Design a protein around this ligand. Structure first.
Ligand SMILES: [Ca+2]
Ligand SMILES: [Ca+2]
Lengths: 101, 874
């Protein structure tokens, strides 16, 4: 039932996408803790029962009836493969990061 | 080697806090070692003193927890009266309890016993010169004197400690000497006592790269330019804070590429003192239009740039121009020399009280002090007040080593903020300051007074204000306002304050005390950046997906192919963004009532952003800093070239740039402009150009180039966005010509003049805005991409309000972002005597001239991609 545009915004956690790149690939804007805070605030704005869904869309994205992915996803970056980016993306809710249920 | 961690706290002179077991707290002993000889061999060996710490049942009292809330649940331990506290803080200290060994964080006990309010630095008498240094943990403090900036030591004098303060009084002849402090103190990061050579925190001048401190009297006649003491009479008139417009400029960028200025003055304080340079004529044009304030990026002593100019490296600016506009070869040449180039923003504070040596003609001598004062004087004379970017949130370096470490060298672990393990916090950037501590608080206020009195500065921009305590912000405000002309030569009531009120990291939700966040700074009279209006205009946010569209980037009106939902979703998002802008246009007030896109009448605070917080958060319009661009992130031209449809012509984007800028200039509150917004400045889509050199940060006052298409920006910061940058850079139709740049400037100048042609754009109070400001294109029936703003004034026989405008009785502004012309019909503005503003009637742009009004139905015909101002004359 957790639909993008209804329960949470389109491109749900776009700030978290950049934060994943800064942490894993080592590249992105300065003041990484300011980027982190907006990512956690975007994550906390999502209702509790939809948070895991919105986190999956960041990682894998939603595929249209047309066949292609739109609202994600974690792609390939220089010396920074998808599966390496994905593993850290799941740990964003944990106590060591944003600390959210 | 013995390298302990610091999990325990010494909070008052008789109390230690530590989060250990309720039972294991019955075997806690305090160890001390002056020579720091402690080791493990398997208990502890090599200690001077051993005293039992007795656990307290009650815990930590309120007066302690109110200062340090993050450790409120910690166990309390009593320190016996037999212990000499003053001597033990100078030693290596550990508490030990199976075996759990940790160090003590001391700032708490240092503020309890050694809080000092008397003279510091250098005090000049008629026959004597006295020095004062705060170092309550130092074992000894000496002063090395030097004859010049290069020679060996002349003399060495010991200092006497009194209440944590080391002092010495010498003769008058000490004046103009160069000196360094010799401090032997225990450093926890090296776990030993080191004899450190350190500069003065209260230094007023330095030699090259802060190698030595110059013992100079700032009141000296030989340091004052002609008529400096009479500058208060020369300073441009400021009736109210509501008349402020801000122009953000970096000192080096201003004259680095300016041929009309001598090469020895290029990129320094002297450039602003030129008679008729291209740069000073540019600032003169804006000032005559209505510009009031100039905000300059960090000018104090920072690290990152060598003061000795002979070490500077350069890029081959001829051979680099032969590369393709979308190549990666230009950035490779800059990155190779970026550490030894002349370029940096200056966000690496070392000493706050001394002007930067690299911006001076000579790093040695009185050069840096005089040329700074000349820069302030010159800008005031052309009618522009000076604002300093102040960075009190962090420091460049820490530890006992390096030329760039000063404060943390003298008093280790006090000036810097640390976590519950004793490690330094890096959330601001590196080495965060701790403004909650008394002596850090004092150092910040004493600095703000130094620049206000000795340099006659007209305002301050606080970098990461949310990392500074509100307590410090409010005390600085009262101190600056209390300054009078007869007592200190500067009218302090005209000094304005603002900053970055971002709430994040270990200081968020008041975890270290009431911090200076946007929300907490409500009703204080200190400004803060409106990031709500910024994101609503541009689209998305600086850290989000680069292709996210907003109000002024064609969210629904002109899709760019990037999926942002269906047509109904983008239209509802566009109307939401418009509601956020309108609150900001009305001064981003808490209590201002606006009819939102649903038709519901909502207060500014009741309208929220899509991810939590309230949009309107201010009690007064002067607390709002409306902007669409700054030095941070991508420039207005760069962000519009990425977000807007790729098929568009550069002439259409030029008009969009004018819309964003005008929305700021015509808004209630205080407009903020980045240098180059008038002349379509580009950084070649660079988002973090702090270390990108002169190549990407170029400001051209010949108006020949906007610096678009000079190769892909540096990899470390932009590499991942290269694929969406390259084709835009490689396309010639993206690069504007000379005619575009000049037309954008002339259109910018015109809007400023409109703002200052009516006091109605600059309403001083919240209650004035409620009564007078009305928006019209509202509800479910509104025309998308159109904002209509009307300002009412006292009219007719016996009006409800006072008269503020002598020429006009009503002003209406129409903002149109649609690709085509729009015909509005507003019944409330019917049968009125409106006409187009005389500035826009004589405008150089032929498109704006076609704006019209009809009294019949209240029709407002406004051209596409245009802002029009209508007025009702008396
Ligand atoms: Ca002016
Ligand atoms: Ca550099």
């Amino acid at each position: 039932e957790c639909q993008p545009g209804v329960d949470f915004p389109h491109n749900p956690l776009a700030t978290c996408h950049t934060y994943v790149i800064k942490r894993v690939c080592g590249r992105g804007p300065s003041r990484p803790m300011l980027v982190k805070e907006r990512c956690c605030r975007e994550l906390a704005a999502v209702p509790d029962h939809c948070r895991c869904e919105a986190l999956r869309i960041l990682m894998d994205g939603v595929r249209t009836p047309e066949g292609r992915v739109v609202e994600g996803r974690l792609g390939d970056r220089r010396d920074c493969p998808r599966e390496e980016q994905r593993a850290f993306a799941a740990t964003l809710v944990t106590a060591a990061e944003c600390n959210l249920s | 080697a013995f390298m302990p961690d610091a999990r325990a706290y010494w909070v008052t002179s008789d109390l230690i806090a530590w989060n250990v077991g309720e039972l294991e707290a019955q075997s806690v002993c305090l160890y001390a070692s002056r020579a720091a000889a402690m080791s493990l061999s398997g208990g502890i060996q090599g200690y001077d003193s051993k005293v039992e710490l007795q656990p307290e049942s009650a815990g930590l009292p309120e007066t302690v927890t109110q200062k340090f809330p993050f450790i409120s649940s910690y166990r309390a331990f009593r320190v016996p009266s037999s212990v000499d506290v003053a001597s033990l803080v100078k030693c290596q200290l550990v508490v030990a309890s199976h075996v759990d060994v940790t160090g003590l964080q001391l700032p708490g006990v240092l503020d309890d016993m050694f809080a000092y309010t008397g003279p510091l630095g250098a005090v000049f008498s008629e026959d004597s010169v006295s020095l004062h240094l705060w170092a309550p943990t130092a074992q000894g403090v000496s002063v090395c004197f030097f004859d010049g900036p290069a020679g060996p030591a002349l003399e060495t004098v010991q200092l006497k400690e009194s209440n944590g303060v080391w002092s010495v009084t010498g003769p008058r002849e000490w004046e103009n000497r160069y000196y360094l402090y010799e401090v032997d103190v225990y450093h926890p990061t090296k776990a030993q006592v080191l004899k450190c050579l350190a500069g003065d925190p209260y230094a007023r001048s330095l030699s090259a790269n802060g190698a030595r401190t110059w013992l100079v009297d700032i009141n000296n006649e030989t340091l004052k330019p002609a008529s400096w003491d009479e500058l208060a009479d020369e300073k441009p008139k400021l009736d109210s804070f509501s008349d402020i417009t801000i122009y953000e400029l970096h000192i080096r960028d201003f004259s680095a590429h300016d041929g009309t200025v001598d090469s020895d003055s290029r990129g320094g304080f002297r450039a602003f003192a030129y008679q008729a340079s291209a740069g000073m004529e540019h600032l003169r044009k804006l000032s005559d239009a209505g510009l009031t304030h100039v905000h300059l990026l960090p000018s104090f002593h920072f690290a990152g740039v060598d003061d000795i100019k002979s070490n500077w490296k350069f890029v081959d600016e001829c051979e680099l121009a032969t590369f393709p506009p979308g190549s990666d070869m230009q950035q490779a040449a800059v990155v190779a020399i970026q550490e030894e180039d002349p370029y940096n923003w200056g966000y690496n504070p070392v000493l706050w009280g001394v002007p930067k040596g690299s911006y001076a003609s000579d790093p040695d001598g009185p050069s840096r002090i005089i040329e700074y004062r000349q820069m302030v004087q010159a800008l005031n004379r052309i009618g522009l007040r000076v604002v300093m970017d102040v960075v009190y949130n962090h420091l460049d370096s820490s530890g006992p080593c390096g030329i760039s470490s000063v404060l943390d060298k003298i008093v280790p672990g006090y000036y810097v903020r640390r976590d519950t393990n004793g490690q330094i916090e890096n959330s601001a950037a590196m080495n965060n300051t701790a403004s909650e501590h008394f002596m850090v608080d004092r150092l910040i206020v004493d600095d703000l007074l130094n620049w206000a009195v000795n340099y006659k500065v007209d305002g301050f921009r606080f970098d990461l204000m949310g990392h500074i305590m509100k307590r410090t912000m409010m005390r600085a405000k009262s101190a600056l306002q209390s300054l009078t002309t007869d007592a200190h030569g500067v009218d302090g009531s005209k000094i304005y304050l603002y900053g970055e009120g971002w709430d994040f990291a270990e200081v968020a939700r008041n975890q270290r005390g009431i911090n200076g966040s946007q929300l907490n700074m409500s009703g204080t009279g200190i400004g803060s950046f409106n990031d709500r209006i910024r994101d609503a205009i541009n689209g998305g946010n600086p850290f989000g997906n680069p292709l996210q569209q907003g109000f002024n980037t064609g969210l629904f009106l002109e899709p760019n192919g990037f999926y942002q939902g269906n047509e109904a979703d983008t239209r509802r998002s566009l109307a939401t963004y418009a509601d956020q802008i309108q609150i900001g246009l009305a001064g981003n007030l808490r209590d201002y009532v606006l009819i939102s896109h649903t038709g519901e009448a909502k207060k500014g605070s009741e309208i929220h952003t899509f991810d939590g917080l309230p949009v309107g958060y201010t009690a007064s319009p002067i607390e709002t800093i409306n902007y669409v661009s700054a030095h941070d992130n991508e420039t207005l031209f760069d962000v519009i070239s990425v977000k807007t449809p790729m098929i568009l012509s550069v002439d259409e984007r030029c008009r969009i740039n004018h819309l964003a800028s005008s929305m700021m200039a015509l808004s209630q509150g205080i407009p903020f402009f980045h240098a180059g917004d008038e002349i379509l400045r580009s950084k070649s889509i660079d988002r973090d150009s702090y270390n990108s050199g002169d190549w990407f940060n170029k400001l051209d006052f010949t108006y020949e180039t906007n610096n678009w298409g000079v190769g892909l920006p540096p990899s470390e910061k932009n590499e991942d966005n290269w694929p969406l940058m390259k084709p835009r850079l490689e396309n010639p139709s993206f690069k504007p010509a000379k005619g575009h740049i000049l037309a954008a400037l002339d259109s910018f100048v015109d809007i400023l003049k409109i703002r200052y042609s009516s006091p109605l754009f600059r309403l001083s109070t919240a209650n004035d805005i409620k009564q007078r400001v009305r928006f019209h294109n509202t509800g479910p029936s509104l025309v998308p991409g159109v904002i209509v703003m009307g300002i009412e004034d006292a009219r007719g026989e016996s009006p409800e309000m006072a008269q503020l405008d002598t020429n006009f009785s009503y002003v209406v502004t129409v903002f149109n972002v649609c690709p085509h012309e729009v015909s509005m019909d507003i019944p409330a503005l019917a049968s009125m005597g409106f006409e187009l503003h005389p500035v826009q009637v004589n405008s150089s742009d032929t498109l704006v001239r076609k704006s019209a009004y009809e009294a019949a139905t209240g029709r407002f015909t406004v051209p596409g991609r245009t802002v029009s101002v209508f007025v009702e004359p008396r």
